[PDB]
């Protein structure tokens, strides 16, 4: 198991998937096209807002 973590917008989580393109997908964090695993996200306004 390797586990990664980070903070992003709500709609921006759409970019977290294999082979995607975008600001996060291209210039901050990119998943390999053959990535296997799970992507997990949740609201964090109570903390990060």
């Amino acid at each position: 198991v390797y586990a990664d973590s980070f903070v992003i917008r709500g709609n921006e989580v759409s970019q977290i998937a294999p082979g995607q393109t975008g600001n996060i997908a291209d210039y901050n964090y990119k998943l390999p096209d053959d990535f296997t695993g799970c992507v997990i996200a949740w609201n964090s306004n109570k903390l990060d807002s």
């Binding site: 294999p18 082979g19 995607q20 393109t21 096209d33 053959d34």
Partner: protein
């Protein structure tokens, strides 16, 4: 490989490879049938000679 992104081009590449292999398998089968026919004709021609 230029319009679509790596992991959504794969099912497309997979389908293209399947279609191009199914068109070659039948070609090889027809070639084998025609080669068997030519071999029978050549055996008959050699017997006649």
């Amino acid at each position: 490989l230029s319009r679509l992104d790596p992991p959504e081009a794969e099912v497309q590449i997979d389908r293209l490879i399947t279609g191009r292999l199914q068109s070659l398998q039948t070609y090889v089968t027809q070639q084998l049938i025609r080669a068997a026919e030519i071999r029978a004709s050549a055996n008959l021609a050699a017997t006649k000679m």
